[PDB]
Design a protein around this ligand. Structure first.
Ligand code: 6E1
Length: 138
């Protein structure tokens, strides 16, 4: 397994047709997972499954600019389960990040950070065993 938190450099940032795949297993009794696509200190795309927010499961997505979080986008479809292996695929498209979990479309997140070629790091954190994190162009 890879160390968590894990930093995956994205050389030259992201670009449409780049597919980022995260394989891992959720820990028992998980509380949260986070993916943070970073442009320097900014977070262009934060993808945050929360396993117990007031006894509900939700995926929170947002952007952090100058240390301020913006308006959240919430998705109640929640494909993760404690103890189970998952695959997260993030496909960069011209207008949004497109996320599929376990081969099923989950959500899209419109680009708020415009300089895609400066989104040069992905941090992977939270209550997972991380197997692999990689990218390819499709
Ligand atoms: C792996 O471990 C970590 C992790 F996974 C993380 F995500 C984080 C992290 O930075 N999390 C922050 C990040 O996820 C951020 C994204 O917006 O949200 C905060 S918590 C956040 O705190 C805000 C106030 O400071 C608000 O309370 C946020 N809630 C809402 O905007 C919100 C709400 F409160 C209503 F009641 C709504 O009901 C309709 C609603 F829609 C809301 F969006 C509430 O979601 C989290 O603390 C972290 F630090 C970790 F260490």
């Amino acid at each position: 397994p890879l160390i968590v938190p894990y930093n995956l450099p994205l050389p030259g940032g992201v670009v449409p047709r780049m597919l980022i795949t995260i394989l891992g297993t959720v820990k028992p009794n998980a509380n949260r997972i986070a993916l943070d696509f970073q442009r320097g200190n900014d977070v262009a795309f934060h993808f945050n499954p929360r396993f117990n927010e007031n006894n509900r499961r939700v995926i929170v997505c947002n952007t952090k600019l100058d240390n301020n979080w913006g308006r959240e986008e919430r998705q109640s479809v929640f494909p993760f389960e404690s103890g189970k292996p998952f695959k997260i695929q993030v496909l960069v498209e011209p207008d949004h990040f497109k996320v599929a979990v376990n081969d099923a479309h989950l959500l899209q997140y419109n680009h708020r950070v415009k300089k895609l070629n400066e989104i040069s790091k992905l941090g992977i954190s939270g209550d997972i065993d991380l197997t692999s994190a990689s990218y390819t162009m499709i």
